[PDB]
Amino acid sequence: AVDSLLDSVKWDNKGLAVAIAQNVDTGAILMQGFANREAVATTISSRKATFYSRSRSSLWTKGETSNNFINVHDVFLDCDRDSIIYLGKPDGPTCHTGAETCYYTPVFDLNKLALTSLYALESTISQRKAEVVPSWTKRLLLNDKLLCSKIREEANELCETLENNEDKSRTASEMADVLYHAMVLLALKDVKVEEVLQVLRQRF
Amino acid sequence: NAVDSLLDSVKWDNKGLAVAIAQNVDTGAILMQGFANREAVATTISSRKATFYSRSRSSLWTKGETSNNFINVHDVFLDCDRDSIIYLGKPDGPTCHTGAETCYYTPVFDLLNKLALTSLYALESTISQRKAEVPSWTKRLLLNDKLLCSKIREEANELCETLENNEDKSRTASEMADVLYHAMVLLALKDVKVEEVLQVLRQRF
Ligand SMILES: Nc1ncnc2c1ncn2[C@@H]1O[C@H](COP(=O)(O)O)[C@@H](O)[C@H]1O
Ligand SMILES: Nc1ncnc2c1ncn2[C@@H]1O[C@H](COP(=O)(O)O)[C@@H](O)[C@H]1O
Ligand SMILES: Nc1ncnc2c1ncn2[C@@H]1O[C@H](COP(=O)(O)O)[C@@H](O)[C@H]1O
Ligand SMILES: [Mg+2]
Ligand SMILES: [Zn+2]
Ligand SMILES: [Zn+2]
Ligand SMILES: [Zn+2]
Ligand SMILES: [Zn+2]
Ligand SMILES: [Zn+2]
Ligand SMILES: [Zn+2]
């Protein structure tokens, strides 16, 4: 059944397809390599992301020496079946330099990681926490009583958009209000958003 | 120029291409993966529209040039070895030519059609299925506004108590998940996508 599936992949002249490893919990692109028929099959059977190293001319499972495996949860093919997503959860940092992902060379800021909207805000909140030990985040990080009251009150306002039939944009605006203040509490308690999303996934 | 010096450091392959991945700036969903040469990257930067090189037609191709479903690029990233590119952008419409939101919807373990979703947006999709099928806790919350809102306020209370009562970080993590779930049932009631919420956060930068 695996044989019938690998035959459908559109490989290039070298027998390769693009294989992208993505964090199953956050969506961050960890790394992008290449896979041949055997590299994808090994990923399927071993549940650890495996690629074809063109340089070393051999199969390569991420973590085989460093133990920073990418435990693969699902594999996706795009429409033309020439691109692959390894959707996995990494044991440690993915890049061989030690960086969390391989993408940290911004072209517009001309070393910061590539972050989507939710994880960039978490990163900003983290920077305020470091400069703590005039900012609204620093004010919340330095006042537990104010932060907790703000979370309770904003949660109240989110519900009032449902209870009082406010516009959908009002609900989104208040959900953002809840999300920001909760992440300031997350930072105080040393909790990453990824850990929270892992909890959600474990409750499936 | 500074961009020219940046394109010069890019390690292009023998035919002058590099892998280009389009990713949703707000959610992280991978929209599509193509290939870019210097001019596809340079034009992507200048026009702020994701532009690739169509190898089959052997010409430049801007995603959306016919369908108007452009990918409006917010950032461009190079990986460590500088042979892989991420166009980080916000798409006008569905990216795949079939109409799918993204191009990646062929699960391999289900073959041994669902979109590839990460945890937060998979929970959003599940809550959405419960809303349409309306013995499940989500359907019950969708059928009782007073109960749903009571649970949100109660769970937001519990999250604060983990800070107030010096509870363990695992307790904070567990309670934050509780707040997130019940909030997303309220989002589904008000027809709010998580992406819409994250756009608001991004707009408050
Ligand atoms: N994310 C990565 N992308 C490309 N090459 C890598 C990556 N991580 C490690 N390597 C290299 O691949 C080999 C396997 O290392 P590792 O899988 O990290 O134990 C070593 O030569 C590493 O330097
Ligand atoms: N208290 C909770 N915290 C987080 N996720 C939850 C919770 N209750 C239900 N879920 C999620 O909702 C899904 C469907 O639940 P149900 O509507 O009871 O079938 C589960 O598989 C979980 O992912
Ligand atoms: N009231 C707020 N609601 C939502 N996001 C906020 C709020 N205040 C600050 N932020 C976020 O926190 C970042 C840093 O704010 P500050 O710590 O006040 O400099 C902003 O760029 C926003 O992304
Ligand atoms: Mg109000
Ligand atoms: Zn393709
Ligand atoms: Zn790397
Ligand atoms: Zn508010
Ligand atoms: Zn690379
Ligand atoms: Zn497509
Ligand atoms: Zn709880």
Numbering used by the authors:
A (entry chain A): 48 to 157, 166 to 188, 194 to 264
B (entry chain B): 47 to 158, 166 to 187, 194 to 264
Show me the paper's own sentences about this structure.
The enzyme consists of two distinct domains, active respectively as a phosphoribosyl-AMP cyclohydrolase (PRA-CH) and phosphoribosyl-ATP pyrophosphatase (PRA-PH). In this work, we obtained crystal structures of HISN2 enzyme from Medicago truncatula (MtHISN2) and described its architecture and interactions with AMP. The enzyme dimer is formed by two mutually swapped polypeptide chains, forming a bilobial protein—each domain forms one lobe.
In the MtHISN2-AMP complex, AMP molecules were found near MBSs in both domains, PRA-PH and PRA-CH. AMP bound in the PRA-PH domain formed hydrogen bonds through the phosphate moiety and the adenine ring. The adenine N1 atom interacted with the Arg263 guanidine group. We also observed the π-π stacking between the adenine ring and the Tyr240 side chain; the approximate inter-ring distance was 3.6 Å. The proposed orientation of the adenine ring of PR-ATP was rotated by ~ 180° in the ring’s plane to the AMP pose in the MtHISN2-AMP complex. This means that the binding of AMP to the PRA-PH domain in our MtHISN2 complex apparently shows the positioning of the N1-phosphoribosyl of PR-ATP and the plane of its adenine ring. The second AMP binding site was located within the PRA-CH domain. The phosphate moiety formed an extensive network of hydrogen bonds with surrounding residues. We also observed edge-to-face interaction between the aromatic rings of the adenine and Trp107, with ≈ 3.5 Å distance and angle ω ≈ 45°. Distances observed in the MtHISN2-AMP complex, Zn2+…H2O of 2.4 Å, Nδ of His143…H2O of 3.0, and H2O…C6 of 3.1 Å, are consistent with this mechanism.
